[PDB]
Amino acid sequence: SIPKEVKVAIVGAGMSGLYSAWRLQSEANVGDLAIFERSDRTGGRLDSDLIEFKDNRAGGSTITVKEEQGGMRFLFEGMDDLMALFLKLGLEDQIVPFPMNSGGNNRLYFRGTSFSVNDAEQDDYHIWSALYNLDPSEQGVNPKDIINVVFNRILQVNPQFPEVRGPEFWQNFRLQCQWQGEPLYNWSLWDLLTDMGYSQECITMLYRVLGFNGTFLSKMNAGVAYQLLEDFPADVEFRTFKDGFSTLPNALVDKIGKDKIHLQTSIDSIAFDKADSKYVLKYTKIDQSGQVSEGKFKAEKVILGLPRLALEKLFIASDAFKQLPKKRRDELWDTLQSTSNQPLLKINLYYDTAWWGTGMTGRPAVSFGPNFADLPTGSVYPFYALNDELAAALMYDERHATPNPDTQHKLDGIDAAKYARPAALTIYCDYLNINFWSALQNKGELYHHPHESELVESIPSDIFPASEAVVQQATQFFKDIFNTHYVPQPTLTSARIWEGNVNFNVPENLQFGFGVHQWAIGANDKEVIEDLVEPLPNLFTCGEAYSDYQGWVEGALRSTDLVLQKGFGLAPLSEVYEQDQGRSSSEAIQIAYRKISNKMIMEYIDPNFSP
Amino acid sequence: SIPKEVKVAIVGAGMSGLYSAWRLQSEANVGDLAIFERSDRTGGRLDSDLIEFKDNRAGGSTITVKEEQGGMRFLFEGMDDLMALFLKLGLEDQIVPFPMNSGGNNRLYFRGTSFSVNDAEQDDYHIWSALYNLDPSEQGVNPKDIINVVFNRILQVNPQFPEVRGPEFWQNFRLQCQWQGEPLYNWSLWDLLTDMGYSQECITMLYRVLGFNGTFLSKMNAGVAYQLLEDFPADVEFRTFKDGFSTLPNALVDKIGKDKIHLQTSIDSIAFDKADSKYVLKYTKIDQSGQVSEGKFKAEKVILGLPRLALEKLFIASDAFKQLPKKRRDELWDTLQSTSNQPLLKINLYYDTAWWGTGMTGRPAVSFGPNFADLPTGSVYPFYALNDELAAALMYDERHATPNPDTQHKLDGIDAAKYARPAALTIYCDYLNINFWSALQNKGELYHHPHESELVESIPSDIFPASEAVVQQATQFFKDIFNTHYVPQPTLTSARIWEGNVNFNVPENLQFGFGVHQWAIGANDKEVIEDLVEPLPNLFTCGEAYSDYQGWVEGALRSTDLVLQKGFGLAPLSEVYEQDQGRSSSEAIQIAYRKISNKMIMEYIDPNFSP
Numbered sequence A, B: 001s002i003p004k005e006v007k008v009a010i011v012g013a014g015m016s017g018l019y020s021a022w023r024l025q026s027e028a029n030v031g032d033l034a035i036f037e038r039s040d041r042t043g044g045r046l047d048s049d050l051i052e053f054k055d056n057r058a059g060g061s062t063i064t065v066k067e068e069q070g071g072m073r074f075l076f077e078g079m080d081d082l083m084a085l086f087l088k089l090g091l092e093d094q095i096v097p098f099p100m101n102s103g104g105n106n107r108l109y110f111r112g113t114s115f116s117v118n119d120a121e122q123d124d125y126h127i128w129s130a131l132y133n134l135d136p137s138e139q140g141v142n143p144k145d146i147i148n149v150v151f152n153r154i155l156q157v158n159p160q161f162p163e164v165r166g167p168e169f170w171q172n173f174r175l176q177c178q179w180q181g182e183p184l185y186n187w188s189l190w191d192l193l194t195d196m197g198y199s200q201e202c203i204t205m206l207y208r209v210l211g212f213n214g215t216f217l218s219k220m221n222a223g224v225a226y227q228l229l230e231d232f233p234a235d236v237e238f239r240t241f242k243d244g245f246s247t248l249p250n251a252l253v254d255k256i257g258k259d260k261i262h263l264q265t266s267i268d269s270i271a272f273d274k275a276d277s278k279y280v281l282k283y284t285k286i287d288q289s290g291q292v293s294e295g296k297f298k299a300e301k302v303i304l305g306l307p308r309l310a311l312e313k314l315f316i317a318s319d320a321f322k323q324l325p326k327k328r329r330d331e332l333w334d335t336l337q338s339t340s341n342q343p344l345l346k347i348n349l350y351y352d353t354a355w356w357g358t359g360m361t362g363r364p365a366v367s368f369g370p371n372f373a374d375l376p377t378g379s380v381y382p383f384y385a386l387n388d389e390l391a392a393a394l395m396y397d398e399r400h401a402t403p404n405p406d407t408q409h410k411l412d413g414i415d416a417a418k419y420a421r422p423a424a425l426t427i428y429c430d431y432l433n434i435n436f437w438s439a440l441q442n443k444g445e446l447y448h449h450p451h452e453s454e455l456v457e458s459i460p461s462d463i464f465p466a467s468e469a470v471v472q473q474a475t476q477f478f479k480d481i482f483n484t485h486y487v488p489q490p491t492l493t494s495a496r497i498w499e500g501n502v503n504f505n506v507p508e509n510l511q512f513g514f515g516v517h518q519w520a521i522g523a524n525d526k527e528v529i530e531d532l533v534e535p536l537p538n539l540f541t542c543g544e545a546y547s548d549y550q551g552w553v554e555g556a557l558r559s560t561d562l563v564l565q566k567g568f569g570l571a572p573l574s575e576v577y578e579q580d581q582g583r584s585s586s587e588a589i590q591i592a593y594r595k596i597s598n599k600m601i602m603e604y605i606d607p608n609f610s611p
């Protein structure tokens, strides 16, 4: 059942569409809105899974493993809009550490060699000079520090151009700093380092050892690439939600109501009734028996919270756009082209127990963070069965305290216990590595462990299994990476390739947009962003794909915030938060987390902890 | 001035549109046809340049250098349609060797190491085991032979599945041979070698050392990739035209008439007048003062000789297509998607003299063929000022004769003389290397040698100069590749990036389609090809992009030949040739070339030559 006419139509039930709805309901009384979503699920590029494995330990019990098919981490600083969102939805009590290292034990596979992070530090970083035919100025330093030093040189040469480095910083950085008279957004990073005199060997080392080579090889420009590279310092304290990033959209859905959200309802095109001055949205819904329907309705205001690919599709097919003048239609198409599509993927393999601990490898145990490799892997992130004690031990560790032997010893048993509970690995890769897995996942039968109901009762709806080819090659690279003969067969598998599709012969449950976007070369994104708020009268665009903060949910909320500003008069949520609370969302979130971490620690770790 | 109405409208003045016109005029009396071309030049992806440098040797004389901005080589076997075309246009007297090696002196740059082909043979191919962390089964053999052996294994395991290996062979190969129960066109080559057990090191070696990595990393499927890899054996005797591949389209234009060809006339869209049963083609022409015009005309039969990208553009914007039923419109869009777009580029740098001969390097001289590298270069091909004696010496060399010292000694002076005349290098790269040059060519001022009229009188219309950034980095890689401190500044430069564009803010003289295409994964190209001959009634498609022989002009002529068959009753030109001549075009072209080579040799090389 679909309304006649709504005050605002919301196209897209990702984070951008949901956020708009909740803010207009709550902050603007607007209750005559509805959300139209083409998939059978809400939340878009945020997609968590919770598997209740059958406890089949010697001892009808269930053990839950959280995992991510999309978004996974966030930060307390630089995401004020997202922090305020958390604080206002009362979700901060679920916030849990996302750790990024294992004390140097994380894995590294390059040029047919498997080793650890601590290994790579040996001997003035000798191994890198041995695997890569580096220039003298490029030897004897840690790879990541090369990107670091280059950043510092860029800043030294642009004095014309700050403790917390947020989207303002990153927009001005790429739009105002230059190199050899050319500003950074007219540069590719690949051309940048080369022009700076780095060897091609060094440059391949950089994009292989950073796991995500699109920053170098894609058409994305150097300035936005840097924004991404300097988002993962050594001392990052990422956090996540215990039950997954889907906590946030689900929490938004409860507070919107499933009755204003219309699933399996793709908005096909939009015209504008010149008479009663209302947009007219042609759509296609599948009902619950699976029998299609094609309708149409009006709306005074239209909100498209859609990425680059979806927006071109509507633009092509909509009378509201075609009947625009040649110059403005072509100008507006042209500025759609100014953000580059970044494919991403994540393939999760669950195991009844974890085999990368010292008990199973005979090598120093791997715990948390990315295991990088120049194999199609890109990077590999371990995920563990949910467990309160473990998060407390992780919370103790975010504090760089000095445990006394009693507490150190208990942290040991905790660090080792997790290997006995179920767990999973994610292969998270980008640009260059995608095609390898593409062809793999679409060829041959799909993988299923035998007796797949004897462990795992419900299997979530959003889980498409990895192809048997994908598991096969993933199992061989894992042996390579973790330097062990022993990698068993997954209990469960999921594959998800965030790469937009233009083929009609693809089911809905397999159609997914481009995982991330990043500003293209030559793209003045100050003009692009502002021209895409209200490009037609009362028709708005918002979302991550053309934000200040590409690749992150904060990007979606800031881009939506401009829509809620220009079309509805709401100021930025972070500014709203401060006025109502007398302090920032950054400050409020830290104080709140400190208390829960403080508790969790005295409860499980050191009952005598003092901050 | 543009006709009311023609019997056949030809959209595209590349090789496919020109060939259709000439065959319908000549073989079918149809003279009420006209060609509509969006650019200011005929010929499409065939684009030769001829520069008359000012002879400024000590001694108003001009020295001409042929070069290629697109297509450059062909073969006497497997291109029967193209050979018959040559023989019927009387162009065989201009056919000249295109050599592919320099006796082992060609260059190789990999992992920061410059060396020669003869070097790589040393010591059971030792250098490859030293640059690449190869598996034991992958050491001690020449890289190219790995692709060779893998081919032979594929054939061994498919006995169900031939002296001259033409398009029939290659279609059946990829559509009927399988590996692990999956036919080759359901495979990527990357996944294929991996599943066969090759190391990732080995696989990076293969796609770097073959210069054109799209065969591995693009979405093209394994079978078509092989067709391309086994098109360059060791013993290839490529030939070209002395004045360039543009000889062929120009020769077609003379025999069509510039009066039936309409340049700067883009066909914008096509509808179908249901009344007088005629297609109706909306267009846009620029006149000779540069003032636009938008007209329209009819045609009984429409011939689109256009690649994948151009065909989608019309499909989107044409009432003849939109008003098709949902299922057939979406089916036909879907099968447009079944050939993968392969970007290509070629950047030519001309020099008053050649600096890679032993006189300028102190190293064994480089002569002909690809100098490969894992640098963004991809490959580098030397081009020399035209010179009759040189082609005779090259013709002597296609015969693997054994010169007596007199003749050997004269071939020496000839081999060395060319370094003193002007010459040029082409950087010919693909897939992964494109973006590097992209950003380079679009940033900063464009390169011009000072006093650029004091040598080079006319500069051809199709020459866009390389950006000053492109020359800068090209000059540094050349020093790397040719292992010399000394690489001077080009006298003239051209850049041309065969990568389709969707931006309106691009001039016409910079809009170029995708350089080549290759069959995607999952694409049964027997069905795709035949469904795209006459997809609407009396509206036809032909060209390279969906041919049996992607990447070559023979592909365009065979795909057009199906259009001339189904819509007009003409049999294949090669079959036509045989009936009229009593023998093949392969046989006739070899006998003709043998005679001219036989002459040329006795004239310049060994006046006592016996075949």
Ligand SMILES: Cc1cc2nc3c(=O)[nH]c(=O)nc-3n(C[C@H](O)[C@H](O)[C@H](O)COP(=O)(O)OP(=O)(O)OC[C@H]3O[C@@H](n4cnc5c(N)ncnc54)[C@H](O)[C@@H]3O)c2cc1C
Binding pocket: A011, A012, A013, A014, A015, A016, A017, A036, A037, A038, A039, A042, A043, A044, A045, A046, A069, A070, A071, A072, A073, A074, A265, A266, A267, A268, A305, A306, A307, A310, A344, A345, A346, A498, A513, A514, A515, A516, A542, A543, A544, A545, A551, A552, A553, A554, A555, A556
């Ligand atoms: C692999 C991956 C990992 C990530 N990790 C992180 C992370 O750790 N931290 C972080 O902060 N961010 C992360 N992100 C980014 C985050 O997922 C996004 O920034 C954000 O979720 C996208 O918000 P959006 O609403 O702009 O887009 P989306 O979430 O993609 O919303 C678009 C929605 O519109 C729907 N839609 C499309 N067309 C139509 C139509 N015609 N009619 C109706 N509905 C339509 C789509 O189905 C989808 O539901 C990650 C992204 C990916 C791909």
Ligand SMILES: Cc1cc2nc3c(=O)[nH]c(=O)nc-3n(C[C@H](O)[C@H](O)[C@H](O)COP(=O)(O)OP(=O)(O)OC[C@H]3O[C@@H](n4cnc5c(N)ncnc54)[C@H](O)[C@@H]3O)c2cc1C
Binding pocket: B011, B012, B013, B014, B015, B016, B017, B036, B037, B038, B039, B042, B043, B044, B045, B046, B069, B070, B071, B072, B073, B074, B265, B266, B267, B268, B305, B306, B307, B310, B344, B345, B346, B498, B513, B514, B515, B516, B542, B543, B544, B545, B551, B552, B553, B554, B555, B556
């Ligand atoms: C770098 C490179 C090197 C190559 N080397 C070789 C080689 O050595 N040997 C070989 O055999 N082949 C080679 N080829 C392949 C060869 O160039 C092509 O196979 C062939 O020339 C293309 O023929 P076509 O007519 O199918 O396409 P095109 O030549 O591309 O013809 C398309 C034409 O249609 C025009 N057009 C497009 N849209 C419209 C419109 N709306 N209205 C009007 N006109 C329009 C375009 O401007 C163009 O003129 C090479 C190709 C490239 C890119």
Ligand SMILES: NC(=O)CC[C@H](N)C(=O)O
Binding pocket: A072, A073, A212, A228, A516, A550, A551, A552
């Ligand atoms: N490459 C990107 O922009 C992805 C960033 C994303 N937030 C992540 O966790 O990886």
Ligand SMILES: NC(=O)CC[C@H](N)C(=O)O
Binding pocket: B072, B073, B212, B228, B516, B550, B551, B552
């Ligand atoms: N990669 C391709 O298909 C290009 C082939 C083309 N005939 C050439 O000379 O390179």
